[PDB]
Design an enzyme around this catalytic site. Sequence first.
Site, PDB file in Angstrom:
ATOM      1  N   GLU A  25       0.868  -1.208   0.000  1.00 22.94           N
ATOM      2  CA  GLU A  25       0.000   0.000   0.000  1.00 22.94           C
ATOM      3  C   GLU A  25       0.890   1.238   0.000  1.00 22.94           C
ATOM      4  O   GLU A  25       1.688   1.377   0.957  1.00 22.94           O
ATOM      5  CB  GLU A  25      -0.900   0.003   1.230  1.00 22.94           C
ATOM      6  CG  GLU A  25      -1.718   1.265   1.435  1.00 22.94           C
ATOM      7  CD  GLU A  25      -2.776   1.102   2.523  1.00 22.94           C
ATOM      8  OE1 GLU A  25      -2.850   1.977   3.418  1.00 22.94           O
ATOM      9  OE2 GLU A  25      -3.524   0.088   2.483  1.00 22.94           O
ATOM     10  N   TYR A  57      -6.487   6.995  -0.874  1.00 26.10           N
ATOM     11  CA  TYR A  57      -7.267   8.116  -1.449  1.00 26.10           C
ATOM     12  C   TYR A  57      -7.017   9.342  -0.572  1.00 26.10           C
ATOM     13  O   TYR A  57      -6.085  10.101  -0.882  1.00 26.10           O
ATOM     14  CB  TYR A  57      -8.736   7.712  -1.581  1.00 26.10           C
ATOM     15  CG  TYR A  57      -9.587   8.624  -2.428  1.00 26.10           C
ATOM     16  CD1 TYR A  57      -9.153   9.071  -3.665  1.00 26.10           C
ATOM     17  CD2 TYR A  57     -10.852   9.008  -2.009  1.00 26.10           C
ATOM     18  CE1 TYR A  57      -9.940   9.899  -4.449  1.00 26.10           C
ATOM     19  CE2 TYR A  57     -11.653   9.835  -2.782  1.00 26.10           C
ATOM     20  CZ  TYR A  57     -11.196  10.283  -4.009  1.00 26.10           C
ATOM     21  OH  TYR A  57     -11.978  11.098  -4.778  1.00 26.10           O
ATOM     22  N   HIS A  85      -8.023   3.001  -3.614  1.00 22.53           N
ATOM     23  CA  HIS A  85      -8.958   3.185  -2.473  1.00 22.53           C
ATOM     24  C   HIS A  85     -10.045   4.168  -2.900  1.00 22.53           C
ATOM     25  O   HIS A  85      -9.696   5.214  -3.466  1.00 22.53           O
ATOM     26  CB  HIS A  85      -8.206   3.670  -1.231  1.00 22.53           C
ATOM     27  CG  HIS A  85      -7.199   2.694  -0.728  1.00 22.53           C
ATOM     28  ND1 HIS A  85      -6.849   2.619   0.605  1.00 22.53           N
ATOM     29  CD2 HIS A  85      -6.474   1.749  -1.368  1.00 22.53           C
ATOM     30  CE1 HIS A  85      -5.947   1.673   0.762  1.00 22.53           C
ATOM     31  NE2 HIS A  85      -5.701   1.123  -0.433  1.00 22.53           N
ATOM     32  N   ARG A 115     -15.163   3.482   3.533  1.00 19.97           N
ATOM     33  CA  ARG A 115     -16.228   4.502   3.712  1.00 19.97           C
ATOM     34  C   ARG A 115     -15.550   5.874   3.645  1.00 19.97           C
ATOM     35  O   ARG A 115     -16.050   6.733   2.904  1.00 19.97           O
ATOM     36  CB  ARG A 115     -16.998   4.222   5.009  1.00 19.97           C
ATOM     37  CG  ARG A 115     -18.162   5.163   5.286  1.00 19.97           C
ATOM     38  CD  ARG A 115     -17.743   6.301   6.198  1.00 19.97           C
ATOM     39  NE  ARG A 115     -17.749   5.944   7.612  1.00 19.97           N
ATOM     40  CZ  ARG A 115     -16.985   6.502   8.553  1.00 19.97           C
ATOM     41  NH1 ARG A 115     -16.117   7.455   8.254  1.00 19.97           N
ATOM     42  NH2 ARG A 115     -17.088   6.096   9.807  1.00 19.97           N
ATOM     43  N   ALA A 152     -17.407   2.305  16.248  1.00 18.90           N
ATOM     44  CA  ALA A 152     -18.300   1.129  16.333  1.00 18.90           C
ATOM     45  C   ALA A 152     -18.923   1.075  17.731  1.00 18.90           C
ATOM     46  O   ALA A 152     -18.169   1.198  18.707  1.00 18.90           O
ATOM     47  CB  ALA A 152     -17.547  -0.136  16.023  1.00 18.90           C
ATOM     48  N   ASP A 158     -19.355  -4.278  14.810  1.00 20.10           N
ATOM     49  CA  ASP A 158     -18.202  -4.102  13.886  1.00 20.10           C
ATOM     50  C   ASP A 158     -17.975  -5.421  13.125  1.00 20.10           C
ATOM     51  O   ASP A 158     -17.836  -5.376  11.883  1.00 20.10           O
ATOM     52  CB  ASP A 158     -16.972  -3.598  14.654  1.00 20.10           C
ATOM     53  CG  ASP A 158     -15.939  -2.823  13.841  1.00 20.10           C
ATOM     54  OD1 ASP A 158     -16.279  -2.276  12.741  1.00 20.10           O
ATOM     55  OD2 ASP A 158     -14.791  -2.754  14.325  1.00 20.10           O
ATOM     56  N   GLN A 176      -6.561  -3.452   9.703  1.00 22.36           N
ATOM     57  CA  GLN A 176      -5.728  -2.380  10.290  1.00 22.36           C
ATOM     58  C   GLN A 176      -4.430  -3.058  10.716  1.00 22.36           C
ATOM     59  O   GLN A 176      -4.491  -4.259  11.035  1.00 22.36           O
ATOM     60  CB  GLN A 176      -6.461  -1.759  11.482  1.00 22.36           C
ATOM     61  CG  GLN A 176      -5.752  -0.561  12.086  1.00 22.36           C
ATOM     62  CD  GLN A 176      -5.719   0.590  11.119  1.00 22.36           C
ATOM     63  OE1 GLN A 176      -4.657   1.019  10.676  1.00 22.36           O
ATOM     64  NE2 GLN A 176      -6.899   1.078  10.770  1.00 22.36           N
ATOM     65  N   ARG A 272       8.167   3.848   1.365  1.00 24.00           N
ATOM     66  CA  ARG A 272       9.576   3.484   1.694  1.00 24.00           C
ATOM     67  C   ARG A 272       9.717   1.955   1.545  1.00 24.00           C
ATOM     68  O   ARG A 272       8.969   1.203   2.220  1.00 24.00           O
ATOM     69  CB  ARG A 272       9.945   4.036   3.084  1.00 24.00           C
ATOM     70  CG  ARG A 272      10.644   5.394   3.068  1.00 24.00           C
ATOM     71  CD  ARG A 272      12.180   5.373   2.934  1.00 24.00           C
ATOM     72  NE  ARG A 272      12.735   4.573   1.819  1.00 24.00           N
ATOM     73  CZ  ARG A 272      13.640   3.581   1.918  1.00 24.00           C
ATOM     74  NH1 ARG A 272      14.139   3.245   3.100  1.00 24.00           N
ATOM     75  NH2 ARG A 272      14.046   2.938   0.828  1.00 24.00           N
TER      76      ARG A 272
END
Length: 287
Positions: A25, A57, A85, A115, A152, A158, A176, A272
């Site tokens: 990512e 994004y 994203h 979201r 949440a 969640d 995450q 990196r």
Amino acid sequence: FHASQRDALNQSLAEVQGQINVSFEFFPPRTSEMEQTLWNSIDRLSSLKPKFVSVTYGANSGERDRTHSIIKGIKDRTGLEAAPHLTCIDATPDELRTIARDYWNNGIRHIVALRGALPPGEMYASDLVTLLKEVADFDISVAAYPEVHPEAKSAQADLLNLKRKVDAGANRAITQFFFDVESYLRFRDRCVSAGIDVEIIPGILPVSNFKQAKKFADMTNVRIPAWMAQMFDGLDDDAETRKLVGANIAMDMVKILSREGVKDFHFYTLNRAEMSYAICHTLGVRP
Ligand SMILES: Cc1cc2nc3c(=O)[nH]c(=O)nc-3n(C[C@H](O)[C@H](O)[C@H](O)COP(=O)(O)OP(=O)(O)OC[C@H]3O[C@@H](n4cnc5c(N)ncnc54)[C@H](O)[C@@H]3O)c2cc1C
């Protein structure tokens, strides 16, 4: 005693050499130096043949022309499946269908349905999934929160929310980042309890900068273990030592996760390449 556990782990990691898929990512660069950084990093980390790469994004950044360009530049420079994203922020259901057909016809066949962050200052990811999967048969990844998303009502909600997103038609949940492996292992077991049938791909954050990581963690409600604060305590000016202490922590985690079955990893590179590439080296992912 704890010596045969280490020799088995190390050897059984050396044996899982070629059976592991990795994703990286990236975020869109702001400066000219960070633009060059990104493109070397993509050059390096491409030679690892990652199953895909995502570009963040950034809610109300206005640089979707920063994201879309990068996704192109990646798709052309390297020929890797780049996965953007896409949020539900400053965007109407009308617009997104267009964004989706703009993407799908340029070759972008995989999207990460988030979201987006814009709390009190509407349309949920499950919807954005269902929306996207009736624009076309997309590859869709969604976020998962092993330590529970900050807003949440509870863990149960969640988890049920993640069911909903997969039910809607998401293939992969990318977690995450987390520092307690136990956290993740438990969470993956709940998923299958509660009948969510997708790969819970762990998010790995290699920590060179702890001040920055300590920041990112308080925001996203991600526990920083005791040991880990003491571990970075005192290395504030000392970046070489921070890099070894962090690579070790990542390498230990991906070794344990690997033994536990995990054959897919997602690296929050922060544009990196070195830490990630090195960790990938330990997972037998090599040119
Ligand atoms: C892999 C990954 C990539 C990310 N990439 C980006 C990025 O590119 N850009 C960015 O800005 N952020 C990004 N984030 C951060 C994330 O988008 C934010 O933290 C955001 O607040 C959560 O979006 P979501 O996809 O989890 O939304 P959802 O899955 O919809 O959940 C968001 C929150 O709403 C709650 N919720 C769900 N359904 C309902 C309902 N019906 N009623 C009320 N509450 C509900 C959930 O429990 C949760 O608390 C990323 C996170 C991860 C893990």
